[model samples]
Target: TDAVLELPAATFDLPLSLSGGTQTTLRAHAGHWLVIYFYPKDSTPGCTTEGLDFNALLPEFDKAGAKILGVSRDSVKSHDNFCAKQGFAFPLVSDGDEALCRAFDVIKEKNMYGKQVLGIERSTFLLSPEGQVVQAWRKVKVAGHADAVLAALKAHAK
Candidate 1:
């Protein structure tokens, strides 16, 4: 498990692969509450469920001036398929280079199949309009996380 980062100023200017074969940068999402959640892989059981939960609640997030972005090392092609299949309204960013992962400090070494490896620990970071990390949920459980994030967005609304 990784430690939650200090409530500090955060900045990211990296480009991300968006749905429908598009590209965008982190700065483009300024002026709103941003949900940057990391997952293990695309179409994994818990990943799909969590993606669905966030997708289903997009309206509420929009109403609260919040936006959701699911991040994984999965390829643009991979994200496109998953999004089309799951009908996710928000973008699923491809951190294939792990640029954002390292910047967010979510990379963790964990044992899997009797071998140790480095992977993106499931985590979420909430950002404010000016790129401040308002709240952080490290090692997130898929259950009720989106709702919990929504509650935090509401509770910490500026």
Candidate 2:
């Protein structure tokens, strides 16, 4: 799907549950920049590193007037454990229904030990206050990613 390119005008009203019984919607964070990152799973090596990197830059993200969210198909219970263990100051949204995953088109056929399977492709999207996507990263590598996102936010969002 070409939904990734359509994110500039994509408005999602999907239900999302976070750790500690927190519930929110994508539209709830309207009027501010948003970073919705899709990862493969929780407690995994690459996922953990990406989460930690983003968590480390929460303050900077806020300063740039952007709210950060990490999404996966995992349950809220699993997100809670991962957040607690990693000391994440932001919310990790559950996309168990795969609504968000489908919208973002992050779910794809991946090679898992010579086995073909469907999974998130490690992507990130940055949206403006008006809900227009200003930047997007697909098949993202964890190293220096948070920093790059912050730099983009500071440069574009002022």
Candidate 3:
């Protein structure tokens, strides 16, 4: 089943291989709002644009008491390269086993080039400081998504 609003905290207390050499858990960033955005692939056009937007607003997100995290099936090595190439200041989690993605239920059967294929659907979840999911965005559009999230975050943080 997909993650729901107010999902149990334990469901996302997952181990993670984050960009910039962080081997931590989802629970590690407790006491701050968490932006857990799942992307279809790393460095693709849409992904790159979204990543850039988040990277640019990271300072604002931090000031709003939120941490931005990108998740994908891409390897940690890929995450490192992507972040370096894009100059992203935030961290990315490499969900290679799909276990983490499965928990969020972001994995999907999708149409690509007229073929049905399995992949991670672009999704994002906002979690409260206590780690319960506060909001979910599935089937996301890349355009202005980060701005939308930031606006929502600022409102939500109040």
Total backbone collisions for each predicted model: 0, 1, 0
What is the TM-score (0 to 1) of candidate 1? 0.89
For 1-158, candidate 1 gives per-residue lDDT tens digits of 22245432333566677767787766787888888999989998999999999999999999998888999999989999999999888999887898788888899997888999898889998878867776899899889999999988888885
The per-model lDDT (C-alpha) reads: 0.84, 0.85, 0.85
User: Cα deviation of 151 in candidate 2 (Å)?
Assistant: 0.7
Which 10 residues in a row give candidate 1 its minimum summed lDDT?
Answer: 1-10
C-alpha root-mean-square deviation, each candidate? 3.5, 3.0, 2.8
**Candidate order, lDDT descending:** 3, 2, 1
TM-score for candidate 2, residues paired by index: 0.89
lDDT, candidate 2, 1-158, per-residue tens:
31236742343666688877878877788899899899989999999999999998888987877899999999999999999999999999888888888877788996788899988889999877866667889999899998998898888876
Compared with the true structure, what per-residue lDDT tens digits does model 3 show for residues 1-158? 32256444565666788887777776787888999899988989999999998989988998998988899989998999999999998889998898778878787996878999988889998877877777788999989899999988888788
| Candidate 1: residue 16 Cα off by (Å) | 1.5
Off by more than 4 A, model 1: 1-11, 111-116
How do all models score by TM-score? Answer: 0.89, 0.89, 0.89
